Design a protein around this ligand. Structure first.
Ligand code: V
Length: 106
């Protein structure tokens, strides 16, 4: 449930999606990404541990993962229409959201 472990999980599943041939392979990888994003959202960084939940610092941290989840869910909508190619392009765009949610807290 480490933040770094959740980042690894997200990158593992993005690779699976880029290699995928069918929408079910993509769907399963996106499902795992959503779980990893929600687990990451719980992994408050040591430097923010003492911050109030209502603090702007924690608002930013939490909501980076909310945003990643929103678009994982949009990519799921595509995988659930058998649109393998469209869901793969949506997945590629998740890298930017992943970076925005996690990179500055590593
Ligand atoms: V958005």
């Amino acid at each position: 449930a480490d933040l770094e472990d959740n980042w690894e999980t997200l990158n593992d599943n993005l690779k699976v999606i880029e290699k995928a041939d069918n929408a079910a392979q993509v769907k399963d990888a996106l499902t795992k990404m959503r779980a990893a994003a929600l687990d990451a959202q719980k992994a408050t960084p040591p430097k923010l541990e003492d911050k109030s939940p209502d603090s702007p610092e924690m608002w930013d941290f939490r909501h980076g993962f909310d945003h990643l989840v929103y678009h994982i869910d949009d990519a799921l909508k595509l995988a659930n229409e058998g649109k393998v190619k469209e869901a793969q392009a949506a997945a590629e765009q998740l890298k930017c959201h992943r970076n925005a949610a996690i990179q500055k807290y590593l």
